[PDB]
Design a protein around this motif. Structure first.
Motif, PDB file in Angstrom:
ATOM      1  N   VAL A 205      57.513  75.522 -29.687  1.00  0.00           N
ATOM      2  CA  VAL A 205      58.767  76.206 -29.263  1.00  0.00           C
ATOM      3  C   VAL A 205      59.956  75.413 -29.544  1.00  0.00           C
ATOM      4  CG1 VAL A 205      60.059  78.008 -27.931  1.00  0.00           C
ATOM      5  CG2 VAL A 205      57.826  77.906 -27.758  1.00  0.00           C
ATOM      6  N   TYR A 206      60.866  75.920 -30.366  1.00  0.00           N
ATOM      7  CA  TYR A 206      62.243  75.426 -30.792  1.00  0.00           C
ATOM      8  C   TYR A 206      63.506  75.976 -30.645  1.00  0.00           C
ATOM      9  CZ  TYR A 206      58.392  72.950 -32.914  1.00  0.00           C
ATOM     10  OH  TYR A 206      57.162  72.147 -33.452  1.00  0.00           O
ATOM     11  N   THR A 207      64.404  75.099 -30.216  1.00  0.00           N
ATOM     12  CA  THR A 207      65.744  75.713 -30.062  1.00  0.00           C
ATOM     13  C   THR A 207      66.378  76.213 -31.379  1.00  0.00           C
ATOM     14  OG1 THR A 207      66.395  73.931 -28.289  1.00  0.00           O
ATOM     15  CG2 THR A 207      67.987  75.078 -29.344  1.00  0.00           C
ATOM     16  N   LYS A 208      66.960  77.287 -31.434  1.00  0.00           N
ATOM     17  CA  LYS A 208      67.557  78.116 -32.667  1.00  0.00           C
ATOM     18  C   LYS A 208      68.910  77.571 -33.088  1.00  0.00           C
ATOM     19  CE  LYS A 208      67.409  82.710 -34.838  1.00  0.00           C
ATOM     20  NZ  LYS A 208      66.743  83.935 -34.715  1.00  0.00           N
ATOM     21  N   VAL A 209      69.099  76.264 -33.718  1.00  0.00           N
ATOM     22  CA  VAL A 209      70.174  75.886 -33.948  1.00  0.00           C
ATOM     23  C   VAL A 209      71.387  76.579 -34.418  1.00  0.00           C
ATOM     24  CG1 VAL A 209      71.259  73.954 -35.188  1.00  0.00           C
ATOM     25  CG2 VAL A 209      69.142  73.464 -34.077  1.00  0.00           C
ATOM     26  N   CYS A 210      70.878  77.629 -35.453  1.00  0.00           N
ATOM     27  CA  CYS A 210      71.912  78.482 -36.112  1.00  0.00           C
ATOM     28  C   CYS A 210      72.689  79.197 -35.001  1.00  0.00           C
ATOM     29  CB  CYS A 210      71.256  79.421 -36.967  1.00  0.00           C
ATOM     30  SG  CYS A 210      70.117  80.652 -36.343  1.00  0.00           S
ATOM     31  N   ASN A 211      72.262  79.587 -33.711  1.00  0.00           N
ATOM     32  CA  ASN A 211      73.060  80.095 -32.940  1.00  0.00           C
ATOM     33  C   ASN A 211      74.262  79.267 -32.166  1.00  0.00           C
ATOM     34  OD1 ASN A 211      71.266  82.225 -33.010  1.00  0.00           O
ATOM     35  ND2 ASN A 211      70.344  81.842 -31.006  1.00  0.00           N
ATOM     36  N   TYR A 212      73.970  78.143 -32.447  1.00  0.00           N
ATOM     37  CA  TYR A 212      74.998  76.910 -31.823  1.00  0.00           C
ATOM     38  C   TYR A 212      76.021  76.294 -32.847  1.00  0.00           C
ATOM     39  CZ  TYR A 212      71.572  77.825 -28.159  1.00  0.00           C
ATOM     40  OH  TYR A 212      70.854  78.268 -27.241  1.00  0.00           O
ATOM     41  N   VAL A 213      75.933  76.702 -34.141  1.00  0.00           N
ATOM     42  CA  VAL A 213      76.785  76.008 -35.085  1.00  0.00           C
ATOM     43  C   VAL A 213      78.146  75.947 -34.644  1.00  0.00           C
ATOM     44  CG1 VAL A 213      77.659  75.935 -37.481  1.00  0.00           C
ATOM     45  CG2 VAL A 213      75.188  76.118 -37.082  1.00  0.00           C
ATOM     46  N   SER A 214      78.636  77.213 -34.216  1.00  0.00           N
ATOM     47  CA  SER A 214      80.074  77.633 -33.677  1.00  0.00           C
ATOM     48  C   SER A 214      80.155  76.468 -32.340  1.00  0.00           C
ATOM     49  CB  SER A 214      80.204  78.944 -33.145  1.00  0.00           C
ATOM     50  OG  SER A 214      81.585  79.126 -32.783  1.00  0.00           O
ATOM     51  N   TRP A 215      79.537  76.385 -31.721  1.00  0.00           N
ATOM     52  CA  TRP A 215      79.771  75.566 -30.522  1.00  0.00           C
ATOM     53  C   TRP A 215      79.709  74.121 -30.931  1.00  0.00           C
ATOM     54  CZ3 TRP A 215      75.892  72.235 -28.290  1.00  0.00           C
ATOM     55  CH2 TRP A 215      76.227  71.499 -27.263  1.00  0.00           C
ATOM     56  N   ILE A 216      78.662  73.789 -31.797  1.00  0.00           N
ATOM     57  CA  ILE A 216      78.704  72.118 -32.207  1.00  0.00           C
ATOM     58  C   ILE A 216      79.968  71.765 -32.847  1.00  0.00           C
ATOM     59  CG2 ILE A 216      77.673  70.538 -33.910  1.00  0.00           C
ATOM     60  CD1 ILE A 216      74.871  72.332 -33.370  1.00  0.00           C
ATOM     61  N   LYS A 217      80.316  72.578 -33.659  1.00  0.00           N
ATOM     62  CA  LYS A 217      81.592  72.527 -34.685  1.00  0.00           C
ATOM     63  C   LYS A 217      82.939  72.376 -33.626  1.00  0.00           C
ATOM     64  CE  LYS A 217      79.933  74.118 -39.123  1.00  0.00           C
ATOM     65  NZ  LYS A 217      80.592  72.909 -39.683  1.00  0.00           N
ATOM     66  N   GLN A 218      83.090  73.244 -32.696  1.00  0.00           N
ATOM     67  CA  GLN A 218      84.172  73.364 -31.814  1.00  0.00           C
ATOM     68  C   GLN A 218      84.174  72.068 -31.240  1.00  0.00           C
ATOM     69  OE1 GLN A 218      85.416  73.890 -28.752  1.00  0.00           O
ATOM     70  NE2 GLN A 218      83.747  75.076 -27.677  1.00  0.00           N
ATOM     71  N   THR A 219      83.026  71.704 -30.680  1.00  0.00           N
ATOM     72  CA  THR A 219      82.841  70.711 -29.508  1.00  0.00           C
ATOM     73  C   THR A 219      83.096  69.269 -30.152  1.00  0.00           C
ATOM     74  OG1 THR A 219      81.095  71.626 -28.106  1.00  0.00           O
ATOM     75  CG2 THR A 219      81.017  69.359 -27.992  1.00  0.00           C
ATOM     76  N   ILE A 220      82.686  69.078 -31.529  1.00  0.00           N
ATOM     77  CA  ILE A 220      83.012  67.870 -32.377  1.00  0.00           C
ATOM     78  C   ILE A 220      84.385  67.723 -32.455  1.00  0.00           C
ATOM     79  CG2 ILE A 220      82.786  66.771 -34.547  1.00  0.00           C
ATOM     80  CD1 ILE A 220      79.569  67.853 -34.430  1.00  0.00           C
ATOM     81  N   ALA A 221      84.924  68.817 -32.813  1.00  0.00           N
ATOM     82  CA  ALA A 221      86.351  68.987 -33.205  1.00  0.00           C
ATOM     83  C   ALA A 221      87.335  68.343 -32.135  1.00  0.00           C
ATOM     84  CB  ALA A 221      87.070  70.440 -33.553  1.00  0.00           C
ATOM     85  N   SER A 222      86.794  68.589 -30.889  1.00  0.00           N
ATOM     86  CA  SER A 222      87.869  68.251 -29.697  1.00  0.00           C
ATOM     87  C   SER A 222      87.252  66.927 -28.904  1.00  0.00           C
ATOM     88  CB  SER A 222      87.956  69.538 -28.763  1.00  0.00           C
ATOM     89  OG  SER A 222      89.267  70.485 -29.482  1.00  0.00           O
ATOM     90  N   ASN A 223      86.314  66.248 -29.331  1.00  0.00           N
ATOM     91  CA  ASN A 223      85.638  65.400 -28.452  1.00  0.00           C
ATOM     92  C   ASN A 223      85.439  64.049 -29.489  1.00  0.00           C
ATOM     93  OD1 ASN A 223      84.813  65.925 -25.738  1.00  0.00           O
ATOM     94  ND2 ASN A 223      84.538  68.023 -26.969  1.00  0.00           N
TER      95      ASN A 223
END
Ligand code: H06
Ligand code: CA
Length: 223
Positions: A205-223
């Motif tokens: 069972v694998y984490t479904k990364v496509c669901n998190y792209v928004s969170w990843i991008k915005q997190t990177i953008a501010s950290n």
């Protein structure tokens, strides 16, 4: 990885080893300063090891860089493993080359039947225990959500997918945790959980990364 093959040195250039005195999890380099892994891999004092093949021998292409911060997904539940994703920032930018390279984030989710490459330094036995020194690889299809849910009644959320073989024999395993599932050059999955390894009717069972792209991008953008 059970039932896989020796990848070959630096053939999976986005594959990282997370080290806290020893390899404990995989991860995926997504740009010069950031690694994606599983939230269940969280701990303090992480050193990110890039360019690794044999994790027990310095072979000449390694970059060892300490983590400056880790960000577990805001909604991670350690009991259900829902939202099993974490970002790790490197203290210094990795030097990107042919053997140390980022992997693209998906722009859409992958479908059942898509063939993917899963890799890591985890256990290679489904019964016993044997940890490889060099990176192991497995080509595996994404499984339908219905078959995934049938395999694990009451446990599969919209943030998870199954990949592998219902017949057993080929799977990720302990120590592969946090590592990549890459499909057509995109990071679609993170090694998350399963019931034992390579067991019949119990695919990874694998984490479904496509669901998190928004969170990843915005997190990177501010950290
Ligand atoms: N794909 C699978 N079948 C799979 C993938 C990952 C895992 C994760 N294992 N981790 C462990 O057992 C563990 C880790 C730390 C302490 N005690 C136990 C299992 C199956
Ligand atoms: Ca090495």
């Amino acid at each position: 990885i059970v039932g896989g093959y020796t990848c070959g040195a630096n053939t999976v250039p986005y594959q990282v080893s997370l080290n806290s005195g020893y390899h404990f999890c995989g991860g995926s380099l997504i740009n010069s300063q950031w690694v994606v892994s599983a939230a269940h891999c969280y701990k303090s004092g992480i050193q990110v090891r890039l360019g690794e093949d044999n994790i027990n021998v310095v072979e000449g292409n390694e970059q060892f860089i300490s983590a400056s911060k880790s960000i577990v997904h805001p909604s991670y539940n350690s009991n259900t493993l829902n939202n099993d994703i974490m970002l790790i920032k490197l203290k210094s930018a990795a030097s990107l080359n042919s053997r140390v390279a980022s992997i693209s984030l998906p722009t859409s989710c992958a479908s059942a039947g898509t063939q993917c490459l899963i890799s890591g330094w985890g256990n290679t036995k489904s019964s016993g225990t044997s940890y490889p020194d060099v990176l192991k690889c497995l080509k595996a299809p994404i499984l339908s959500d219905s078959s995934c849910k049938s395999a694990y009644p009451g446990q599969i959320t919209s943030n998870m997918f199954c990949a592998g073989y219902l017949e057993g024999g080929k799977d990720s395993c302990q120590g592969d945790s946090g590592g990549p599932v890459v499909c057509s050059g995109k990071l679609q999955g993170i090694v998350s959980w399963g019931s034992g390894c390579a067991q019949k009717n119990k695919p990874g069972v694998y984490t479904k990364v496509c669901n998190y792209v928004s969170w990843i991008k915005q997190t990177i953008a501010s950290n």
